[PDB]
């Protein structure tokens, strides 16, 4: 055990850094916070329908293997995180 929980793989690390995350190991809480921040400041969510994230053409969409996803049905987000966070 240690204080940090996960090490993101490179494309996810880039996303987290783009949102203002510092360093390269994190708690899962930090990963979720900065991923949300990224989506917020890249404005990938639909202004009208804000559960919908349009990530096609973004590195996040590359990672998800998807043009969009819903935060109300976040299972592909968790799929991606399971694949792109390496446990410490």
């Amino acid at each position: 055990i240690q204080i940090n929980q996960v090490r993101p793989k490179l494309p996810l690390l880039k996303i987290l850094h783009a949102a203002g995350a510092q360093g390269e190991m994190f708690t899962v809480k930090e990963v979720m916070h900065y991923l949300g921040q990224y989506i917020m400041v890249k404005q990938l969510y639909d202004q009208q329908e804000q559960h919908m994230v349009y990530c096609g053409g973004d590195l996040l969409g590359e990672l998800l293997g998807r043009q969009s996803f819903s935060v109300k049905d976040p299972s592909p987000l968790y799929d991606m995180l399971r694949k792109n966070l390496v446990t410490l």
Binding site: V28, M32, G36, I39, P74, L77
Partner: peptide, 12 residues
């Protein structure tokens, strides 16, 4: 709803 409000509801 608000993106940040929905996002905050997500579990670990």
């Amino acid at each position: 709803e608000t993106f940040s409000d929905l996002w905050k509801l997500l579990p670990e």
